């Protein structure tokens, strides 16, 4: 159980764990209203706070899904056994959570629905929830086999500076 | 073969115990370290899970050169009878998550 | 990239001839069992399998790199 | 059910008291106790973000109890 | 299970013997099993094959371990085996006669398995 | 006994770093552990200078990325118990700490 | 079957592989990369970096 890697390499390996997880989860919790994570190592314990809007579908009946997820991480990155501990979290104010708003629009569209009325419906929600402004783009095909672009915009926006 | 009859058991029994399997995408793995201990010199995990997946009984994710196979209820019934196990045993997990 | 051009041979895998099975034990009177050629002597061999009667070559088929007498 | 609602709480009930009387009974995510304005005392309503539904479904009348001033708490959805 | 009748007795073998992995099906595997001391039981069945094995099996039982049983109608024991394990002994996908089976310590040694063989051995 | 115990901090965020150092210097000086101040070490540059264009075409452009790490360490000399007690608690941000038995 | 399937890969551009899918061509090692320059860009937002210059 030693020694330990250089301080320069210490941050890179943390970043790789922070990033890989964040795309692992997005391919499973897409329908559950995923919105991110926030990792924290704590004394002799890992915390992985799995942020999603509806904790219901994440939990499952008898906590099956959360049990699957913990057993995965325990084998995959070769964690010492029983150190890993998951936690869930529900976010309040869901219209500032761009990641979830975009991935909700996805399943509305892929569910089979018109584009204009869908874009309007998501727009007023993120405006209502609080926001100076907001924007939506849909670039690709529709009504033939040449591509187009469709912008739906309301309020303020910024594009330059820090 | 396709693979021995010993090495089938060692995958199907190991899956039943953790409730989940994971592996990497390679074809030059020499003995497959990182469990199944030193008796899979080839694909075998990936090749046997895929056939199992064809007939349902499991789900499969894939992300950054790593598989993730999630056992399901239907496969628990199958594996329970297939390996001649008690009518109510799940050693993978069974408790309420708080 | 482009399609394969004609060969004038190809043959895949031999059919591993469909020989009659177990005549390796000979019975002329009972309870006697008349064994022919010696049963394989290695520790890792079980010595319940026969060795090849392959004269001018004498070879255990359970072995696959070792134990080839020839006389 | 949007909030796990608890009533009939004594004035000895605090966020940490409920955290205790819930944690070995299924780990919670957060208590929201009506602490009186400018007073740590309770008011009688508590919203318990238990973060779970399974372990709570597994027992309904044990957590209501376990020993508290010879009183019993409410579990409600 | 059984009452120590010959027919229900050989069925009781196959159930726990499967778990013990004692089944040496086919004449070649039966021979290697009984030429070894791993075997403890031999069962034969009606001729569907050559008149050589019927002689030879008695000859092997003589020298090494006497234990033989003969029960006719190959299709009975042929039906009792699966294609892997339990899940259909009916099964028009494949069913075929064993014609001989050899079992190692007659499978698990437990209940009625012990009694069926001990009943036969003292009278034979 | 009283051992020279070194509390090393390391971070990438100057706010998150510095206030957590301050907390440990107050709590130490409060208990008169004869604490020695922060020794701020040179901030190090990870540089990555790579193409901005996949499948190079068009005007040749690049992109400078940088990460700035920070190190600084406070040296204490006091019993190892009360140090290892108080150190690991009272840390809000994602900032690392490494305790050393002795160095001097 | 076969008695070979492989031949020495111990150094060179074929014995290291990059993490896109086992992609290459795009020789990479830096500071412990093993990470593909096209995707490195997409992880500018993700942690490891935030652009500041």
From Swiss-Prot, chain A:
Modified positions (N6-acetyllysine) in chain numbering: 62
Entry keyword set: Acetylation, Apoptosis, Cell cycle, Cell division, Cytoplasm, Cytoskeleton, DNA damage, DNA repair, DNA-binding, Isopeptide bond, Lyase, Membrane, Methylation, Mitochondrion, Mitochondrion inner membrane, Mitosis, Nucleus, Phosphoprotein, Ribonucleoprotein, Ribosomal protein, RNA-binding, Transcription, Transcription regulation, Translation regulation, Ubl conjugation
UniProt EC number: 4.2.99.18
Entry's localization field: Cytoplasm; Nucleus; Nucleus, Nucleolus; Mitochondrion inner membrane
Positions bearing the Glycyl lysine isopeptide (Lys-Gly) (interchain with G-Cter in ubiquitin) cross-link: 90
Topology in membrane: Peripheral membrane protein
GO cellular component terms, semicolon-separated: cytosolic ribosome; cytosolic small ribosomal subunit; mitochondrial inner membrane; nucleolus; spindle
Phosphoserine found at: 6, 35, 104
Positions of post-translational N-acetylalanine modification: 2
Record's subunit section: Component of the 40S small ribosomal subunit. Identified in a IGF2BP1-dependent mRNP granule complex containing untranslated mRNAs. Interacts with HNRPD. Interacts with PRMT1; the interaction methylates RPS3. Interacts with SUMO1; the interaction sumoylates RPS3. Interacts with UBC9. Interacts with CDK1; the interaction phosphorylates RPS3. Interacts with PRKCD; the interaction phosphorylates RPS3. Interacts with PKB/AKT; the interaction phosphorylates RPS3.
Annotated protein name in UniProt: Small ribosomal subunit protein uS3
Organism: Oryctolagus cuniculus (Rabbit)
Source lineage: Eukaryota, Metazoa, Chordata, Craniata, Vertebrata
Curated annotation (Swiss-Prot), chain C:
Region annotation Disordered: where it falls in the sequence: 1-14
Residue intervals of every C4-type zinc finger in the record: 40-63
Subcellular localization: Cytoplasm; Nucleus, Nucleolus
Crosslink site: Glycyl lysine isopeptide (Lys-Gly) (interchain with G-Cter in ubiquitin): 26, 32
Modified residues (N6-acetyllysine): 23, 32, 71
PTM entry text: Monoubiquitinated at Lys-26 and Lys-32 by RNF25 in response to ribosome collisions (ribosome stalling): ubiquitination promotes subsequent activation of RNF14, leading to EEF1A1 ubiquitination and degradation and rescue of stalled ribosomes. Deubiquitination at Lys-32 by USP16 is required for maturation of the 40S ribosomal complex.
Function, as annotated: Component of the 40S subunit of the ribosome. Part of the small subunit (SSU) processome, first precursor of the small eukaryotic ribosomal subunit. During the assembly of the SSU processome in the nucleolus, many ribosome biogenesis factors, an RNA chaperone and ribosomal proteins associate with the nascent pre-rRNA and work in concert to generate RNA folding, modifications, rearrangements and cleavage as well as targeted degradation of pre-ribosomal RNA by the RNA exosome.
Subunit structure and binding partners: Part of the 40S ribosomal subunit. Part of the small subunit (SSU) processome, composed of more than 70 proteins and the RNA chaperone small nucleolar RNA (snoRNA) U3.
Protein name as annotated: Small ribosomal subunit protein eS31
Swiss-Prot record, chain E:
N6-succinyllysine: residues carrying this PTM: 121
Location in the cell: Cytoplasm; Nucleus, Nucleolus
Superkingdom in the source lineage: Eukaryota
One example GO MF annotation: structural constituent of ribosome
GO cellular component, one term: nucleolus
InterPro entries, per the entry: Ribosomal_eL30-like_sf, Ribosomal_eL8/eL30/eS12/Gad45, Ribosomal_eS12, Ribosomal_eS12_CS
Chief place where the protein resides: cytoplasm
Classification via PROSITE patterns: RIBOSOMAL_S12E
Keyword Acetylation in record: yes
Gene Ontology BP annotations: positive regulation of canonical Wnt signaling pathway; ribosomal small subunit biogenesis; translation
Pfam families membership: Ribosomal_L7Ae (PF01248)
Gene3D superfamilies for this protein: 3.30.1330.30
UniProt entry keywords in alphabetical sequence: Acetylation, Cytoplasm, Nucleus, Ribonucleoprotein, Ribosomal protein
Assembly description: Part of the small subunit (SSU) processome, composed of more than 70 proteins and the RNA chaperone small nucleolar RNA (snoRNA) U3. Subunit of the 40S ribosomal complex.
PANTHER family registered for this protein in UniProt: 40S RIBOSOMAL PROTEIN S12
Family of this protein: Belongs to the eukaryotic ribosomal protein eS12 family.
Function recorded in the entry: Part of the small subunit (SSU) processome, first precursor of the small eukaryotic ribosomal subunit. During the assembly of the SSU processome in the nucleolus, many ribosome biogenesis factors, an RNA chaperone and ribosomal proteins associate with the nascent pre-rRNA and work in concert to generate RNA folding, modifications, rearrangements and cleavage as well as targeted degradation of pre-ribosomal RNA by the RNA exosome. Subunit of the 40S ribosomal complex.
Name this protein carries in UniProt: Small ribosomal subunit protein eS12
Gene for this chain: RPS12
From Swiss-Prot, chain F:
Phosphoprotein is among the record's keywords: yes
Keyword Ubl conjugation: yes
Modification type Phosphoserine: residues: 78
Compartments (UniProt record): Cytoplasm
One Pfam entry name: Ribosomal_S10
Residues passing through the membrane, by range: none
Top-level taxonomic group: Eukaryota
Protein name listed in UniProt: Small ribosomal subunit protein uS10
Source organism (scientific name): Oryctolagus cuniculus (Rabbit)
